[PDB]
Coordinates of C-alpha atoms and ligand atoms in Angstrom, one line a residue:
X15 CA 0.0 0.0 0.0
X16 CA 1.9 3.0 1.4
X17 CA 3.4 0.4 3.7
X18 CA 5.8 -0.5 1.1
X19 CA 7.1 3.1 0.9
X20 CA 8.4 3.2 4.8
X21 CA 9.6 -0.5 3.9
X22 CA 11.8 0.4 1.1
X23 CA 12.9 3.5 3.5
X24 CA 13.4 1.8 6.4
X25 CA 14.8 -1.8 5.5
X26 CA 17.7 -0.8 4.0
X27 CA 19.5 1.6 6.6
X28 CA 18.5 -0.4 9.2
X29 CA 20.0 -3.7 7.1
X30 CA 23.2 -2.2 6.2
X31 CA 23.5 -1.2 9.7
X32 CA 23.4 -4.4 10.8
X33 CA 25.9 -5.4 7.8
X34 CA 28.3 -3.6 8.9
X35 CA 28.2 -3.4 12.9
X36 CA 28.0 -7.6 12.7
X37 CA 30.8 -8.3 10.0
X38 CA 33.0 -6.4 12.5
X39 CA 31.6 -7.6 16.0
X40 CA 31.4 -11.1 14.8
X41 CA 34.8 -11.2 13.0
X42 CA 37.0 -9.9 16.0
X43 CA 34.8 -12.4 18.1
X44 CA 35.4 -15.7 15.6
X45 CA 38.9 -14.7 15.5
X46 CA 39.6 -14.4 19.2
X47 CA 37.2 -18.2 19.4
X48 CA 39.6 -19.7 17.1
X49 CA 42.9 -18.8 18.5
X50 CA 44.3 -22.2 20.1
X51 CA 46.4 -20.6 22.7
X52 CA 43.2 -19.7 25.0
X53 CA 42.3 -22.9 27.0
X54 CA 38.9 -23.9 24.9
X55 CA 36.1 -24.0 27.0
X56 CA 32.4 -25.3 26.7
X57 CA 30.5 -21.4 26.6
X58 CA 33.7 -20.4 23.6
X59 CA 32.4 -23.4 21.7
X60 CA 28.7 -22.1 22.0
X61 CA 29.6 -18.7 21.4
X62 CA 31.5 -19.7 18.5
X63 CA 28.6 -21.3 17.2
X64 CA 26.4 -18.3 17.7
X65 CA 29.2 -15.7 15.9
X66 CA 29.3 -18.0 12.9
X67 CA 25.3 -18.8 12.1
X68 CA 24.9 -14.8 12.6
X69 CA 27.8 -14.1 10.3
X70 CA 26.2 -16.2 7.5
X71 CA 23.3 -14.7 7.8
X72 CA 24.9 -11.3 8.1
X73 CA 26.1 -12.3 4.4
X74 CA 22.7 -11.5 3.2
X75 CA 22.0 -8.3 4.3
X76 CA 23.3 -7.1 1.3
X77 CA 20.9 -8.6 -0.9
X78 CA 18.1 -7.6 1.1
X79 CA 19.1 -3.9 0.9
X80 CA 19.5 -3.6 -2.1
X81 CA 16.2 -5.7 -3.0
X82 CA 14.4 -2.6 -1.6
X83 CA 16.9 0.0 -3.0
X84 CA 15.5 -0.8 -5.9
X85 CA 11.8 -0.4 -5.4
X86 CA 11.0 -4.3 -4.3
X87 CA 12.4 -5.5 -7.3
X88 CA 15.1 -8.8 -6.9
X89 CA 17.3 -9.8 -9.8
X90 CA 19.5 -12.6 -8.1
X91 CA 17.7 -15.7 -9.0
X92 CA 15.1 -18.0 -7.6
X93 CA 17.8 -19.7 -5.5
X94 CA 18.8 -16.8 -3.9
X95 CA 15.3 -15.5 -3.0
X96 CA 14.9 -19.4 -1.3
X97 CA 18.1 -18.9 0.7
X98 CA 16.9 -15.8 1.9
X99 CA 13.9 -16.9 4.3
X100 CA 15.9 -20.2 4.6
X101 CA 19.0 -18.2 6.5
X102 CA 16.3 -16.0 8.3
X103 CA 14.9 -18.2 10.2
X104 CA 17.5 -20.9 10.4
X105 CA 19.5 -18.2 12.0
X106 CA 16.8 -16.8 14.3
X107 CA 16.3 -20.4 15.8
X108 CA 19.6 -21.4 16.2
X109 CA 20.4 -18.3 17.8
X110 CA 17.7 -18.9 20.3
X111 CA 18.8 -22.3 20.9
X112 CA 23.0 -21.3 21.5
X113 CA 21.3 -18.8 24.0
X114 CA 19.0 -21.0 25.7
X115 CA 21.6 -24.3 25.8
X116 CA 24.7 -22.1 27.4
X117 CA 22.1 -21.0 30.1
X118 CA 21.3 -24.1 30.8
X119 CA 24.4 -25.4 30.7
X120 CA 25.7 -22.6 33.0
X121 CA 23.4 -23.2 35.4
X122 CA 24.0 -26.9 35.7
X123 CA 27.1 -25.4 36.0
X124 CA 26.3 -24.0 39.6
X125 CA 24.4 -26.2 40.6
X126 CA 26.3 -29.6 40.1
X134 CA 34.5 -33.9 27.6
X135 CA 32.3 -31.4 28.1
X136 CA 33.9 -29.0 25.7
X137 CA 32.7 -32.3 22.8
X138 CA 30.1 -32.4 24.7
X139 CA 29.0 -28.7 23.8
X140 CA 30.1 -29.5 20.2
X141 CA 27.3 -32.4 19.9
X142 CA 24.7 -30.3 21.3
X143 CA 25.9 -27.4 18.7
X144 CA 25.7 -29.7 16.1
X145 CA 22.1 -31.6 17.4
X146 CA 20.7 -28.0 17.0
X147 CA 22.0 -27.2 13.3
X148 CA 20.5 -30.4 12.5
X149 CA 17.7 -30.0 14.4
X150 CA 16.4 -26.6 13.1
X151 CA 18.0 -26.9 8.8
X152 CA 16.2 -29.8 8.6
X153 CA 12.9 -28.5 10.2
X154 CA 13.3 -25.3 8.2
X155 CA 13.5 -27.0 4.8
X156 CA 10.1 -26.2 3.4
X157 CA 10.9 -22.5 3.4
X158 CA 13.0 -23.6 0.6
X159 CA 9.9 -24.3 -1.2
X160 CA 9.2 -20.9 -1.5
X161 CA 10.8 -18.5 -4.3
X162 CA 10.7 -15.4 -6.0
X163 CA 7.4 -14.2 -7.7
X164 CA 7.2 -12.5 -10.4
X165 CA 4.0 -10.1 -11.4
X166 CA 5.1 -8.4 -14.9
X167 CA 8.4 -6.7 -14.6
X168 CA 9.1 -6.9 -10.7
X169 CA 10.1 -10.3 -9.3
X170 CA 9.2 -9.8 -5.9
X171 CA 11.0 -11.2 -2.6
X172 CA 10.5 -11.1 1.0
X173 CA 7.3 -10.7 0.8
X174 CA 3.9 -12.4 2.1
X175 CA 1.8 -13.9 -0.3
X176 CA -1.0 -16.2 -0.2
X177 CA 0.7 -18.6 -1.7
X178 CA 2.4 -18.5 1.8
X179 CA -0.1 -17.7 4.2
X180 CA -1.7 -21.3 4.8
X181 CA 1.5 -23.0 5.5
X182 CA 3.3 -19.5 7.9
X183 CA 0.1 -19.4 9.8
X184 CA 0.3 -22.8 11.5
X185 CA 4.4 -22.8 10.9
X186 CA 4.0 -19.7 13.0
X187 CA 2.0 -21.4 15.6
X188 CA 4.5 -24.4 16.1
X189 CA 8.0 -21.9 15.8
X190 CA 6.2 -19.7 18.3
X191 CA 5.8 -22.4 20.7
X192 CA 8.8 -24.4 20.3
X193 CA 11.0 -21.6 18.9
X194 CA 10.3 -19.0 20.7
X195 CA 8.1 -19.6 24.6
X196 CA 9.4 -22.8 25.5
X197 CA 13.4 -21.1 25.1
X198 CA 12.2 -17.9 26.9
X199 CA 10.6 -19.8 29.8
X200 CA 13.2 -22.5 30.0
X201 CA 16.1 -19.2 29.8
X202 CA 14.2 -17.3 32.3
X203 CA 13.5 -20.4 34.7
X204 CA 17.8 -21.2 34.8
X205 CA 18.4 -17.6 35.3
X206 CA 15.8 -17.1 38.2
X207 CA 17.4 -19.8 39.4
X208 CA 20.8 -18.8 39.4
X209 CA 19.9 -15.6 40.7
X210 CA 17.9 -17.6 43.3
X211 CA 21.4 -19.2 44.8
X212 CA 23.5 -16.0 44.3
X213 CA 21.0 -14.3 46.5
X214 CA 21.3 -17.1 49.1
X215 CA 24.9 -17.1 49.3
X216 CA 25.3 -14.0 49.5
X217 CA 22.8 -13.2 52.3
X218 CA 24.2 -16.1 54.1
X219 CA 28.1 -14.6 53.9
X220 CA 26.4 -11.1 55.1
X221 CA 25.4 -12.5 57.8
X222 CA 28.4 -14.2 58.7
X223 CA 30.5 -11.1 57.9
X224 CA 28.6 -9.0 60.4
X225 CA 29.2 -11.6 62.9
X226 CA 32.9 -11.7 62.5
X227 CA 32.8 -7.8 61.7
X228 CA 31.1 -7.6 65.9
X229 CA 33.6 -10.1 67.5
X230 CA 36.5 -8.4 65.8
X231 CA 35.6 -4.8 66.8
X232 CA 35.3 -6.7 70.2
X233 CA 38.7 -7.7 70.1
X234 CA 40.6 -4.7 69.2
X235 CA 38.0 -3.1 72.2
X236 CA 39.8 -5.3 74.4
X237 CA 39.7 -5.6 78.0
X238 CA 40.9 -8.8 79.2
X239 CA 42.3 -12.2 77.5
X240 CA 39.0 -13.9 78.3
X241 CA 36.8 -11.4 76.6
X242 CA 39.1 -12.1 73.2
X243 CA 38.9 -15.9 73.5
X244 CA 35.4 -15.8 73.8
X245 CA 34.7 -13.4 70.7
X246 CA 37.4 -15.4 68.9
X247 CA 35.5 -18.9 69.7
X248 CA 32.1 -16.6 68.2
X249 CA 34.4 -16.0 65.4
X250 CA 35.7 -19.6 64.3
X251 CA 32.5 -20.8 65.3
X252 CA 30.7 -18.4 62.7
X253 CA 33.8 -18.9 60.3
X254 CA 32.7 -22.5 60.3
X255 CA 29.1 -22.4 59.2
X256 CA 30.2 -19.9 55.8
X257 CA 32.7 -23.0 55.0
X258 CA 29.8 -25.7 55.1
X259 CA 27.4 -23.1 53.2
X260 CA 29.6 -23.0 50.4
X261 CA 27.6 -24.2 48.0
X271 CA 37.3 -25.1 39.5
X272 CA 39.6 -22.4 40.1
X273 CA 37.4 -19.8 41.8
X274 CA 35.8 -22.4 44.3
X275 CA 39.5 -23.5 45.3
X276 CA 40.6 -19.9 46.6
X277 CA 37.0 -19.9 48.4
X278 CA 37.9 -22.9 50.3
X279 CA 41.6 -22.4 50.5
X280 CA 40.8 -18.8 52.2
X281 CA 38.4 -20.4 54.4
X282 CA 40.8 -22.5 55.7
X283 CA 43.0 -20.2 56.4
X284 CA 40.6 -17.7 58.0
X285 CA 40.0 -20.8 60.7
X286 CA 43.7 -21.4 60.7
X287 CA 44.8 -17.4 61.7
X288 CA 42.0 -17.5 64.1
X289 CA 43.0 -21.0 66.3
X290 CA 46.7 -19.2 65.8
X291 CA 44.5 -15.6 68.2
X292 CA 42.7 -18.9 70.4
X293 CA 46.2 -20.2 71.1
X294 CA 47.5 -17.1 72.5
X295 CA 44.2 -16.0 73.9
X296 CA 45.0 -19.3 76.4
X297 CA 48.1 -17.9 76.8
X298 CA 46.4 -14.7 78.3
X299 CA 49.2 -12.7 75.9
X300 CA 46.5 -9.9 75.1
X301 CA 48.6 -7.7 72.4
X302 CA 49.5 -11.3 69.8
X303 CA 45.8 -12.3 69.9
X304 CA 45.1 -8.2 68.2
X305 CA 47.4 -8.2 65.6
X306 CA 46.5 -11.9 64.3
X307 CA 42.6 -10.9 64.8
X308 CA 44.2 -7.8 62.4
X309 CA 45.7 -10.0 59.7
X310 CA 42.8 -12.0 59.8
X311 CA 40.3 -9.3 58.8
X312 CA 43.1 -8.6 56.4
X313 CA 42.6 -12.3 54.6
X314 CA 38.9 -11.4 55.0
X315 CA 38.3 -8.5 52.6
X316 CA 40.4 -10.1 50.0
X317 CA 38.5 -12.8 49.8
X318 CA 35.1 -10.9 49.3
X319 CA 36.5 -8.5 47.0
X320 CA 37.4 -11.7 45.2
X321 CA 34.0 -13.0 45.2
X322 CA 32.2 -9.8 44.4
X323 CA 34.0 -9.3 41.3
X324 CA 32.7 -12.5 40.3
X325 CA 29.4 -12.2 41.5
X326 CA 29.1 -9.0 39.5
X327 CA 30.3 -10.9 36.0
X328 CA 28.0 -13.8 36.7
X329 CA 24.7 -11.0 37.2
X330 CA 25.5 -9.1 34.2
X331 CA 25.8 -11.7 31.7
X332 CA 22.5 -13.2 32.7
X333 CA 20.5 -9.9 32.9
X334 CA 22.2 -9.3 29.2
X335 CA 20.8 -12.3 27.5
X336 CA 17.6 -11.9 29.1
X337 CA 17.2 -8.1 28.1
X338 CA 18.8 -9.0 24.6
X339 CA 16.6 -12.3 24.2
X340 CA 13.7 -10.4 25.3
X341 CA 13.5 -7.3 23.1
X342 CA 15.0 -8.4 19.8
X343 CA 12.5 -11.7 19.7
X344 CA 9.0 -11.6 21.5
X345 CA 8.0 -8.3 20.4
X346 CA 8.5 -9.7 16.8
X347 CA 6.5 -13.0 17.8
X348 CA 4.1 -11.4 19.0
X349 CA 3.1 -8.9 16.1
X350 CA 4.2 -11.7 13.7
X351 CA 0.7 -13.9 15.6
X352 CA -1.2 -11.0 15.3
X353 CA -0.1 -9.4 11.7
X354 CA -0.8 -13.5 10.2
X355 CA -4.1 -13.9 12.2
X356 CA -5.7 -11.0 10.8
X357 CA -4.3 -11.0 7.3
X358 CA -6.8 -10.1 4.5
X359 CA -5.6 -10.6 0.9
X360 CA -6.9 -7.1 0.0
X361 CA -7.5 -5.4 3.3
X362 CA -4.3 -2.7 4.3
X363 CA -3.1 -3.3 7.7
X364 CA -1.2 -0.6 7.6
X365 CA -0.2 0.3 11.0
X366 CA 0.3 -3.3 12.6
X367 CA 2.3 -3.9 9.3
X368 CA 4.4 -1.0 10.1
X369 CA 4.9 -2.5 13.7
X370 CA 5.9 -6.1 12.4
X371 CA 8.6 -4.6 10.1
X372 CA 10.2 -2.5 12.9
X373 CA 10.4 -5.5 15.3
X374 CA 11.7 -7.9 12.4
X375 CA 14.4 -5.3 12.3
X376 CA 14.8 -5.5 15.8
X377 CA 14.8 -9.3 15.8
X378 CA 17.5 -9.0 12.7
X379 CA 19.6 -7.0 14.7
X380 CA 20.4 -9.9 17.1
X381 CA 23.1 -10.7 15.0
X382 CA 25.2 -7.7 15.8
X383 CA 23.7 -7.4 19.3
X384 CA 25.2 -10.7 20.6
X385 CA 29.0 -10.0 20.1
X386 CA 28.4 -8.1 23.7
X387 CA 28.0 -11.5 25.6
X388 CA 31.0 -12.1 23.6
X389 CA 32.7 -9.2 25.3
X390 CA 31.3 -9.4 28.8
X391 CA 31.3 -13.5 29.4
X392 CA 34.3 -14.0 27.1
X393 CA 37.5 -12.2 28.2
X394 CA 36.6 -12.2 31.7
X395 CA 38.6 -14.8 33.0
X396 CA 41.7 -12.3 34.7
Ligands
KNZ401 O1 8.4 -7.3 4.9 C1 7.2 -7.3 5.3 O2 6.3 -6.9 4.6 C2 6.9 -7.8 6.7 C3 7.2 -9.3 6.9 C4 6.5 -10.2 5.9 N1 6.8 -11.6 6.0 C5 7.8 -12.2 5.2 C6 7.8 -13.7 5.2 C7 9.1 -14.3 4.6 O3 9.8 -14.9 5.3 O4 9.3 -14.1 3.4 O5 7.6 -14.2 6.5 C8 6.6 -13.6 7.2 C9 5.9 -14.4 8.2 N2 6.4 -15.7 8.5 C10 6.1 -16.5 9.5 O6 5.1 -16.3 10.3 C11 7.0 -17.7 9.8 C12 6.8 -18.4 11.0 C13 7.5 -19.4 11.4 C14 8.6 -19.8 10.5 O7 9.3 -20.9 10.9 C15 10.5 -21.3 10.2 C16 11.2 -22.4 11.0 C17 10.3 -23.6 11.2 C18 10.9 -24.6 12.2 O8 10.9 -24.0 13.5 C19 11.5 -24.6 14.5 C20 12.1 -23.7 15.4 C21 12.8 -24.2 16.5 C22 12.8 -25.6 16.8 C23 12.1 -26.4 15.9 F1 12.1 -27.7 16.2 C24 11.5 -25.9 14.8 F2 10.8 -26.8 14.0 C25 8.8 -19.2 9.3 C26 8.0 -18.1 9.0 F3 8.3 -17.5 7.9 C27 4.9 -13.8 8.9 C28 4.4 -12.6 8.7 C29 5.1 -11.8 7.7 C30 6.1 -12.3 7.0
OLC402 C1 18.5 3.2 13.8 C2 18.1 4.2 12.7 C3 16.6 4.0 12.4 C4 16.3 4.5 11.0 C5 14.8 5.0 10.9 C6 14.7 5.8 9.6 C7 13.2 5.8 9.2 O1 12.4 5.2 9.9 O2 12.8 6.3 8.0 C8 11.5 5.9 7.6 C9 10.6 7.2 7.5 O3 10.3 7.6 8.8 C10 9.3 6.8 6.7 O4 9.4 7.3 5.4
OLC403 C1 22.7 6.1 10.5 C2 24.2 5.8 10.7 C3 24.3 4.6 11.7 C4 25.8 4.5 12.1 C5 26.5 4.0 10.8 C6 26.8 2.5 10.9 C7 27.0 1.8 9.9 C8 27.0 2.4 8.5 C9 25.7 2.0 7.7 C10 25.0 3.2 7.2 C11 24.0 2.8 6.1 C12 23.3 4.0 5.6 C13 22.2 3.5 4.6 C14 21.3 4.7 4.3 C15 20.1 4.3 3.4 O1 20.1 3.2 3.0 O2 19.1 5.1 3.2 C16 18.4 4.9 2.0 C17 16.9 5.1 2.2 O3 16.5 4.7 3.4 C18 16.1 4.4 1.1 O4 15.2 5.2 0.5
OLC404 C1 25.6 2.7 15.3 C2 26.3 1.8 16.2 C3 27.8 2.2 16.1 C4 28.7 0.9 16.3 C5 29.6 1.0 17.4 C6 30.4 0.0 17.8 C7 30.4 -1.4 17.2 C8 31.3 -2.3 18.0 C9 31.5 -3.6 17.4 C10 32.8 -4.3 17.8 C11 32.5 -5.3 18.9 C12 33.6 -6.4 18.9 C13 34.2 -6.6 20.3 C14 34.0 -8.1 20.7 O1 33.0 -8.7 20.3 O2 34.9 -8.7 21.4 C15 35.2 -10.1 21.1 C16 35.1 -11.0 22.3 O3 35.6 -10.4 23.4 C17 35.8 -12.3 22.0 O4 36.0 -13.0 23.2
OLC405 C1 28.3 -15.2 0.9 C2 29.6 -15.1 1.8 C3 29.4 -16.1 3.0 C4 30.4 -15.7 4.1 C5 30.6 -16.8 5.1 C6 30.6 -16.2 6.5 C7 31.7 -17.0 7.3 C8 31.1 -18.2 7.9 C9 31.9 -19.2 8.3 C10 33.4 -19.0 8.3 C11 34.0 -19.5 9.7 C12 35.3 -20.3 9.5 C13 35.3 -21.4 10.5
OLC406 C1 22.5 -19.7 9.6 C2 22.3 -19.5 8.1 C3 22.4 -20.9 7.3 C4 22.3 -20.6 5.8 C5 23.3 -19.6 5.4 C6 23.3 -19.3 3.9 C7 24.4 -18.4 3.6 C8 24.3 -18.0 2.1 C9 25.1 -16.8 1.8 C10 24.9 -16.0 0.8 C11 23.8 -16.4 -0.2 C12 23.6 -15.3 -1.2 C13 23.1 -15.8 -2.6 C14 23.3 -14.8 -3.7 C15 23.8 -15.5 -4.9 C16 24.1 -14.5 -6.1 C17 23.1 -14.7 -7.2 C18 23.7 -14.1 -8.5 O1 24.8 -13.6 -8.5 O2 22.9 -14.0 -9.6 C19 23.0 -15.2 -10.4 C20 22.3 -14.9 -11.7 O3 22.4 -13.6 -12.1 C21 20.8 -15.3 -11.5 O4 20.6 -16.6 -11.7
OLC407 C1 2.2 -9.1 24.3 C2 1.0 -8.3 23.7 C3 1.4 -7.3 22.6 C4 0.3 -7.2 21.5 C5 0.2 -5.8 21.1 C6 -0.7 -5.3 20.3 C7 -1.7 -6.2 19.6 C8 -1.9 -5.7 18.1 C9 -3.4 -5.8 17.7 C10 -3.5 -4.9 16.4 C11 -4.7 -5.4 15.6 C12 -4.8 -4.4 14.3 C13 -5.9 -4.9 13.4 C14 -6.0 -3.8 12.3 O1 -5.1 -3.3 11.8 O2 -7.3 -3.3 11.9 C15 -7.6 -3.5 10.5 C16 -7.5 -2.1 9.8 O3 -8.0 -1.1 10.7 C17 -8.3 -2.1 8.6 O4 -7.8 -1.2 7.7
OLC408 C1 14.5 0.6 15.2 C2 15.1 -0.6 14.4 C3 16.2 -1.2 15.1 C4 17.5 -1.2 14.2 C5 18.6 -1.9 15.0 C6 19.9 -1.0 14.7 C7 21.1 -1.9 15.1 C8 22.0 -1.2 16.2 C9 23.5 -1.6 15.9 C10 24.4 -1.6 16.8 C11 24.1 -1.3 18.3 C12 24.9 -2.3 19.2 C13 26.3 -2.6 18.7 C14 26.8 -3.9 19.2 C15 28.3 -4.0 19.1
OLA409 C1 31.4 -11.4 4.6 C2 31.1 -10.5 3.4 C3 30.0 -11.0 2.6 C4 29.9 -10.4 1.2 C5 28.6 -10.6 0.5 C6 28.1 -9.8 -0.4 C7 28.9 -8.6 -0.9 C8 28.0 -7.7 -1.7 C9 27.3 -8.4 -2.8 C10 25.9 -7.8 -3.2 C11 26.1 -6.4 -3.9 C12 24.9 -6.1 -4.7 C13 25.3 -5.1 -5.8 C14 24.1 -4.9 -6.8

C-alpha cells in the first residue's frame, strides 16, 4: 500500500547497519574463538557457534538492501530468494537455541568432555532446526510483470506461515524464553542465598572483631574469637574449578589465623591475639573482593541475555501472531504492518547485538 514506501525507506538503513556493525563484532569475536592458545572451554564453543550462524546470515543483508533500494524488485535468482527466508529463520532459531543451551548449561554449571560435549549439542541444534526449516525452501521469488518480488507475504504462503507460525512460536520462541528465564531465576535464586548467608556471617565476625581490638581482658578475646571460628565455620559448610578452590583455600586459612589468636588468647598474651585478629580481617576483605567481582560478571551476563533475548524476539513473535491472524488478501493493515517490520528489524539485529556477551562472558577470565 503505502506500507511498502516506509519498507523500502526503512529496510535498508537499518540492514546495512546491521551489515556492517555484525561483520566487525562477529569477525573480531570468531577470531579471538579460534585462537588455540586460549584454553577452549564449553560457553567459547557455544559462542563460536552463535558468531558463525549470525555471520552467514549477516552475508545476506546485502541482498536484502539492495532488494528494496531498488523499489522491491530482486534480480538474483530464484535460488537466492529461497536462501533468503531459509537463513532468516535458520539463523533466528539457532540463535535462540545457542542462547537457551549455554544458560542451561551454566546453570547446571552451579548447581552440580564437556567441551565435545558442547560441540554435539551445537551440532544436534543445526540439525535440528536446517532440517525442520527446509520447506521455506519451497518458497521462491514471484514475479508479477516486470518486478520479481522477494521477501514478501503472499497467499501462496499464508496457509502453510500461519500454522508454521504457531508451532515456531511455541517451540522456537516460549518454551526457550521460559526455559532461559527459569535457569536464570534460578541462578539468581542461589546468588542471593549465598550472599545473604556470607552477610550475615560477615557481620558476625565484623562484631567479634571490633570486640577484640576493644579489648579488656584475654577472656573477653577468647570468647569473641570462639564466636568468630565458630561463625567462620558455618560460611565453609554453606559454600555451595579455580574460583571455588581460593573460596575454600581462604576459608581454611581464616580458621587457621583464628586457632593461631585462640592459642595465644589461652596464653592470656592480650597484644598477639590483636594483631593476628588484624591480619585475619586482612585475609577477609580479599576474599570478598574476590568474590564480588565475580558475582558482579556472573549477574550481568545473565540480565544481558535476558534483556537481549527479550526485546529483539518476543515483540516480533508477538506482532508476527497477530499481523498472520488478521491478514486479508486485499485489506491494508497498515499500522500493525508497520509494527511487524520494525520489530523484524529489531529481531535482525540480534546478529550484531550478541558479540556483547562475547565481550562481557568472554575475556573475563583475569
Ligand atoms: O516485509 C514485510 O512486509 C513484513 C514481513 C512479511 N513476512 C515475510 C515472510 C518471509 O519470510 O518471506 O515471513 C513472514 C511471516 N512468516 C512467519 O510467520 C513464519 C513463522 C515461522 C517460521 O518458521 C520457520 C522455521 C520452522 C521450524 O521452526 C522450529 C524452530 C525451533 C525448533 C524447531 F524444532 C522448529 F521446527 C517461518 C516463518 F516465515 C509472517 C508474517 C510476515 C512475513
Ligand atoms: C536506527 C536508525 C533507524 C532509521 C529509521 C529511519 C526511518 O524510519 O525512516 C523511515 C521514514 O520515517 C518513513 O518514510
Ligand atoms: C545512521 C548511521 C548509523 C551508524 C553508521 C553505521 C554503519 C553504516 C551503515 C550506514 C548505512 C546507511 C544507509 C542509508 C540508506 O540506505 O538510506 C536509503 C533510504 O532509506 C532508502 O530510500
Ligand atoms: C551505530 C552503532 C555504532 C557501532 C559502534 C560500535 C560497534 C562495536 C562492534 C565491535 C565489537 C567487537 C568486540 C567483541 O566482540 O569482542 C570479542 C570477544 O571479546 C571475543 O571473546
Ligand atoms: C556469501 C559469503 C558467506 C560468508 C561466510 C561467512 C563466514 C562463515 C563461516 C566461516 C567461519 C570459518 C570457521
Ligand atoms: C544460519 C544460516 C544458514 C544458511 C546460510 C546461507 C548463507 C548463504 C550466503 C549467501 C547467499 C547469497 C546468494 C546470492 C547468490 C548470487 C546470485 C547471483 O549472483 O545472480 C546469479 C544470476 O544472475 C541469477 O541466476
Ligand atoms: C504481548 C501483547 C502485545 C500485543 C500488542 C498489540 C496487539 C496488536 C493488535 C492490532 C490489531 C490491528 C488490526 C487492524 O489493523 O485493523 C484493521 C485495519 O484497521 C483495517 O484497515
Ligand atoms: C529501530 C530498528 C532497530 C534497528 C537496529 C539497529 C542496530 C543497532 C546496531 C548496533 C548497536 C549495538 C552494537 C553492538 C556491538
Ligand atoms: C562477509 C562478506 C559477505 C559479502 C557478501 C556480499 C557482498 C555484496 C554483494 C551484493 C552487492 C549487490 C550489488 C548490486
Amino acid at each position: 500500500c503505502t506500507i511498502e514506501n516506509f519498507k523500502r525507506e526503512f529496510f535498508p538503513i537499518v540492514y546495512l547497519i546491521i551489515f556492517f556493525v555484525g561483520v566487525l563484532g562477529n569477525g573480531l569475536s570468531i577470531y579471538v574463538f579460534l585462537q588455540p592458545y586460549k584454553k577452549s572451554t564449553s560457553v567459547n564453543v557455544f559462542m563460536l557457534n552463535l558468531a558463525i550462524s549470525n555471520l552467514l546470515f549477516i552475508s545476506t543483508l546485502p541482498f536484502r538492501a539492495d532488494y528494496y533500494l531498488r523499489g522491491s524488485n530482486w534480480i538474483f535468482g530464484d535460488l537466492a530468494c529461497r536462501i533468503m527466508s531459509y537463513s532468516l529463520y535458520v539463523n533466528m532459531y539457532s540463535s535462540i537455541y545457542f542462547l537457551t543451551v549455554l544458560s542451561v548449561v551454566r546453570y547446571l554449571a552451579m548447581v552440580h568432555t564437556s567441551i565435545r560435549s558442547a560441540w554435539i549439542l551445537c551440532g544436534i541444534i543445526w540439525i535440528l532446526i536446517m532440517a525442520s526449516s527446509i520447506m521455506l525452501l519451497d518458497s521462491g521469488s514471484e514475479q508479477n510483470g516486470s518486478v520479481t518480488s522477494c521477501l514478501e507475504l503472499n497467499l501462496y504462503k499464508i496457509a502453510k506461515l500461519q500454522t508454521m507460525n504457531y508451532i515456531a512460536l511455541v517451540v522456537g520462541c516460549l518454551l526457550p524464553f521460559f526455559t532461559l528465564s527459569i535457569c536464570y531465576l534460578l541462578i539468581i535464586r542461589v546468588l542471593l542465598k549465598v550472599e545473604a548467608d556470607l552477610e550475615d556471617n560477615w557481620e558476625t565476625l565484623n562484631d567479634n572483631l571490633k570486640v577484640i581490638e576493644k579489648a579488656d581482658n584475654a577472656a573477653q578475646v577468647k570468647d569473641a574469637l570462639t564466636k568468630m571460628r565458630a561463625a567462620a565455620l558455618d560460611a565453609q559448610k554453606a559454600t555451595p574449578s579455580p574460583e571455588m578452590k581460593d573460596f575454600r583455600h581462604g576459608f581454611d586459612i581464616l580458621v587457621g589465623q583464628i586457632d593461631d589468636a585462640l592459642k595465644l588468647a589461652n596464653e592470656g598474651k592480650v597484644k598477639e591475639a590483636q594483631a593476628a585478629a588484624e591480619q585475619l580481617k586482612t585475609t577477609r576483605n580479599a576474599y570478598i573482593q574476590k568474590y564480588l567481582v565475580s558475582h558482579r560478571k556472573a549477574l550481568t551476563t545473565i540480565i544481558i541475555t535476558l534483556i537481549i533475548f527479550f526485546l529483539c524476539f518476543l515483540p516480533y513473535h508477538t506482532l508476527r501472531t497477530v499481523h498472520l491472524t488478521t491478514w486479508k488478501v486485499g485489506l491494508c493493515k497498515d499500522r500493525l504492518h508497520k509494527a511487524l517490520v520494525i520489530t523484524l528489524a529489531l529481531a535482525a539485529a540480534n546478529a550484531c547485538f550478541n558479540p556483547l556477551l562475547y565481550y562481557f562472558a568472554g575475556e573475563n577470565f583475569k
